Amino acid sequence: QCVNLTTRTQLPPAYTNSFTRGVYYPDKVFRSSVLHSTQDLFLPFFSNVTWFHAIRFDNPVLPFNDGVYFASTEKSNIIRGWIFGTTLDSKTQSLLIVNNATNVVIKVCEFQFCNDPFLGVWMESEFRVYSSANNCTFEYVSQPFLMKNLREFVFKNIDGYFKIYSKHTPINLVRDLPQGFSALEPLVDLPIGINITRFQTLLALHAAYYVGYLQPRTFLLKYNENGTITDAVDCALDPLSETKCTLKSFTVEKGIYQTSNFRVQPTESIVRFPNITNLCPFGEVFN
Amino acid sequence: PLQSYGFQPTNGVGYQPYRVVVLSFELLHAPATVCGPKKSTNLVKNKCVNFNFNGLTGTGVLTESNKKFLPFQQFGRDIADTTDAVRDPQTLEILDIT
Amino acid sequence: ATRFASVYAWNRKRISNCVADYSVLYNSASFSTFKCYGVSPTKLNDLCF
Amino acid sequence: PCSFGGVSVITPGTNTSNQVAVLYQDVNCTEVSNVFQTRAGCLIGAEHVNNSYECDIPIGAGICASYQT
Numbered sequence: 001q002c003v004n005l006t007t008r009t010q011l012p013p014a015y016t017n018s019f020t021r022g023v024y025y026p027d028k029v030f031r032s033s034v035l036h037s038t039q040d041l042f043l044p045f046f047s048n049v050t051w052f053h054a055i056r057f058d059n060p061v062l063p064f065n066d067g068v069y070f071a072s073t074e075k076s077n078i079i080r081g082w083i084f085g086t087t088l089d090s091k092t093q094s095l096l097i098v099n100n101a102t103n104v105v106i107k108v109c110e111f112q113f114c115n116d117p118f119l120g121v122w123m124e125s126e127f128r129v130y131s132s133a134n135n136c137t138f139e140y141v142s143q144p145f146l147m148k149n150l151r152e153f154v155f156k157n158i159d160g161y162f163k164i165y166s167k168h169t170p171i172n173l174v175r176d177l178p179q180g181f182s183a184l185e186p187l188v189d190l191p192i193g194i195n196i197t198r199f200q201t202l203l204a205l206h207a208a209y210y211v212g213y214l215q216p217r218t219f220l221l222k223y224n225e226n227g228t229i230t231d232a233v234d235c236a237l238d239p240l241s242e243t244k245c246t247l248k249s250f251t252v253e254k255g256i257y258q259t260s261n262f263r264v265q266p267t268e269s270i271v272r273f274p275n276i277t278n279l280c281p282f283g284e285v286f287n
Numbered sequence: 288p289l290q291s292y293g294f295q296p297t298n299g300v301g302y303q304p305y306r307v308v309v310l311s312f313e314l315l316h317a318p319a320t321v322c323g324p325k326k327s328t329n330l331v332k333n334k335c336v337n338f339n340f341n342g343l344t345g346t347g348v349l350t351e352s353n354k355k356f357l358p359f360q361q362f363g364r365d366i367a368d369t370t371d372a373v374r375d376p377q378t379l380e381i382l383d384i385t
Numbered sequence: 386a387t388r389f390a391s392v393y394a395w396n397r398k399r400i401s402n403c404v405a406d407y408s409v410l411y412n413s414a415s416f417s418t419f420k421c422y423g424v425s426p427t428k429l430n431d432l433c434f
Numbered sequence: 435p436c437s438f439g440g441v442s443v444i445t446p447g448t449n450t451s452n453q454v455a456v457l458y459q460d461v462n463c464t465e466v467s468n469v470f471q472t473r474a475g476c477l478i479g480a481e482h483v484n485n486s487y488e489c490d491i492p493i494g495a496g497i498c499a500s501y502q503t
């Protein structure tokens with residue numbers, strides 16, 4: 001059908017705290033009883049991140065930058081899917097994720113997208129997202145992303161690889177996050193070689209979506225005997241977190257510690273020189 | 288512009304149809320996705336070995352570990368991030384490197 | 386394949402995200418012509434494209 | 435030279451409380467409401483008292499921070 005819902009809900013961004021959620025396992029190394037600090041894209045802790053609901057439905061487009069954290073909750077009629085690309089105006093290839101009850105399709109191709117792409121719905125129909133596709137690169141199929149359990153995801157694009165991470169956590173508040181520390185695991189690594197600049201949430205038509213941009217920040221990641229991350233500190237978030245990261249510890253002893261170096265930046269830049277109007281006759285050597 | 292071929296059962300060999308497949312191998316500054324089968328050797332325990340497990344290399348002696356790794360963790364590292372243990376990609380088992 | 390294309394409209398299969406042993410193509414002795422250029426024909430399975 | 439200096443954090447143990455303040459060496463409180471300007475530097479996230487007390491966490495130049503209600 002490819003009905004443009006044109007609802008224009010225009011909800012306030014309703015930003016909430018990310019708390020200590022937004023962390024995923026950055027690499028393949030097992031660690032135990034150590035505090036490995038690492039710089040990568042994550043949500044800053046306690047940053048204010050938008051929680052937009054389609055619920056009349058909308059599919060808004062946000063900057064992808066270097067990766068985006070996404071999480072959502074739905075009632076009865078469950079929404080499973082995402083659109084990523086450099087434009088999403090059908091001139092270039094893009095990444096379409098359609099996730100059903102038994103498996104997931106993660107595909108990169110040139111899609112002739114609908115004005116307000118939706119999954120028609122007992123399974124999702126891709127024709128209502130886009131009417132046609134060609135110039136395909138790769139269709140990947142694996143397990144579904146299904147489990148009150150918020151489905152938390154991280155979408156990254158590293159060295160040409162699409163990286164999708166996930167976890168499931170119980171929800172005390174429909175419009176807010178479960179509090180506690182997350183550590184999402186990657187499920188999918190796709191060697192496509194295509195850039196993402198724009199991210200669109202893809203909805204199924206019968207719807208609350210938490211979306212935050214990741215930032216290149218250092219986190220002190222505390223690893224247990226299971227190889228898991230059980231806690232973390234967002235470095236240079238506040239002075240206590242600075243002290244914890246500086247000291248490579250999740251605790252700090254009473255005292256005073258040097259963590260940084262303060263510099264006053266210039267307000268203005270002033271150029272002074274002799275006034276010469278004679279374009280130099282080096283050109284005359286050539287002539 | 289397009290001329291049909293008279294591919295007759297009575298054609299001499301030079302006029303018989305042949306199927307042609309051309310495999311073009313393109314190497315770009317992009318992830319390599321079409322790979323050969325790769326090579327392996329027998330797993331040898333309790334000896335000094337030159338290792339390569341799916342690109343993870345170094346030297347040492349392997350023994351069975353007493354620890355478990357996450358599904359995303361194919362190897363482990365110690366206090367100075369040097370290899371602590373590796374997992375065997377054809378027989379996943381965690382083997383400590385000495 | 387059951388059917389092949391016309392030479393004026395040759396088909397193209399884009400191959401990605403997979404593993405193949407190309408020595409199979411020579412070990413079989415099933416082709417009348419088989420020549421390799423750029424890359425040696427001698428079981429060059431240590432390459433990835 | 436444009437104002438600059440080392441930045442240090444005054445902290446209780448983290449299993450006691452999370453109230454911290456930052457001392458910016460030799461700079462103004464406006465360059466870095468609870469801003470204590472002293473000779474050692476400006477301490478941000480702290481108040482001050484002119485009476486003498488036992489030293490707990492040093493600031494410098496004869497001044498130490500401590501925690502009081």
Ligand SMILES: *[C@@H]1O[C@H](CO)[C@@H](O[C@@H]2O[C@H](CO)[C@@H](O[C@@H]3O[C@H](CO)[C@@H](O)[C@H](O)[C@@H]3O)[C@H](O)[C@H]2NC(C)=O)[C@H](O)[C@H]1NC(C)=O
Pocket residue numbers: 376377378379
């Ligand atoms: C990769 O594929 C190989 C195929 O060789 C897998 O090895 C096979 O593992 C199965 C399960 O252990 C073996 O079947 C059973 O093995 C036990 C003891 O080894 C034996 O008592 C049973 O009678 C039965 O045969 C099978 O023998 C073994 N094949 C071998 C060793 O040649 C391997 O598990 C796969 N690895 C991964 C990570 O998927």
Ligand SMILES: *[C@@H]1O[C@H](CO)[C@@H](O[C@@H]2O[C@H](CO)[C@@H](O)[C@H](O)[C@H]2NC(C)=O)[C@H](O)[C@H]1NC(C)=O
Pocket residue numbers: 100101102103104105122123141
């Ligand atoms: C969810 O998506 C997967 C992947 O497309 C579906 O698996 C395909 O099922 C169709 C018919 O349902 C088959 O024609 C394909 O051969 C299957 N593909 C693969 C890779 O197995 C799966 O069936 C979908 N779930 C439901 C409930 O339909």
Ligand SMILES: *[C@@H]1O[C@H](CO)[C@@H](O)[C@H](O)[C@H]1NC(C)=O
Pocket residue numbers: 091092093110135
């Ligand atoms: C089709 O793909 C080719 C190479 O994959 C590329 O050169 C071309 O720009 C693509 N066209 C479109 C419309 O995406």
Ligand SMILES: *[C@@H]1O[C@H](CO)[C@@H](O)[C@H](O)[C@H]1NC(C)=O
Pocket residue numbers: 225226
């Ligand atoms: C983590 O490892 C410890 C040490 O063996 C174990 O007791 C605990 O059950 C593990 N936690 C898990 C598997 O969640």
Ligand SMILES: *[C@@H]1O[C@H](CO)[C@@H](O)[C@H](O)[C@H]1NC(C)=O
Pocket residue numbers: 282283284286287
């Ligand atoms: C003179 O030299 C300058 C710089 O080399 C050049 O831009 C200009 O075209 C020359 N004038 C001529 C060749 O008349």
Ligand SMILES: *[C@@H]1O[C@H](CO)[C@@H](O)[C@H](O)[C@H]1NC(C)=O
Pocket residue numbers: 461462465
């Ligand atoms: C900071 O305080 C010093 C000491 O009085 C003063 O000399 C300087 O002008 C101040 N810097 C400002 C206000 O930027």
Ligand SMILES: *[C@@H]1O[C@H](CO)[C@@H](O)[C@H](O)[C@H]1NC(C)=O
Pocket residue numbers: 481482483484
């Ligand atoms: C001492 O400090 C307090 C609070 O900073 C202030 O109200 C008071 O005026 C000061 N007293 C003197 C004598 O400077």
